[PDB]
Amino acid sequence: GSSGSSGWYHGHMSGGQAETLLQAKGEPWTFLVRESLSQPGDFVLSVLSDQPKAGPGSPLRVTHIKVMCEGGRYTVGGLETFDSLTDLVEHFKKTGIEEASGAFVYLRQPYYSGPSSG
């Protein structure tokens, strides 16, 4: 198929992992959906920022956007909700996300990841 169809769901990824995974790629503005192992029922949205730690040669920080699954609806803590992570991701895929540091983030492209790592 020319294009895909929502392929960010890595099933059940580990926060710490995603960080490394996303970093492994380095792709700036890269999000991915992963089930919260620590939080059964909820989910985490790790997005790769274009903001390095040291700069050139350093890994780009990571932002974990927790997903509050309440009332059969998902929310990142905002008034807006959703039924499926798709209607959520595809939603914030444009509006983007806002960090606490005052910086904003955007889900340019999802994380496909591969089988082998190293």
Burial 86-97 (b: 16+ CB within 10 A, else e): bebbebbbeeeb
As given in the structure block, the two tokens for residue 11 are 């099933």
- In angstroms, the CA 36 to CA 66 distance is 9
Q: What 8-state DSSP symbol labels residue 40?
A: B
Q: Which amino acid is at 76?
A: V
Q: Pick from 70, 56, 73, 66: which is nearest to 97 by CA?
A: 66
CATH number at residue 57: 3.30.505.10
> Taking a C-beta distance cutoff of 8 angstroms, is the pair 108, 25 a contact?
no
> Taking a C-beta distance cutoff of 8 angstroms, is the pair 61, 54 a contact?
no
Range of the domain at 39: 1-118
- In angstroms, the CA 5 to CA 116 distance is 23
**Residue 52: count of CB within 10 angstroms of its CB:** 14
**Residue 106: count of CB within 10 angstroms of its CB:** 18
The structural domain count of the chain equals: 1
User: Which single residue is written with the structure tokens 């807006």?
Assistant: 80
- In angstroms, the CA 29 to CA 62 distance is 10
The structure's method of determination equals: NMR
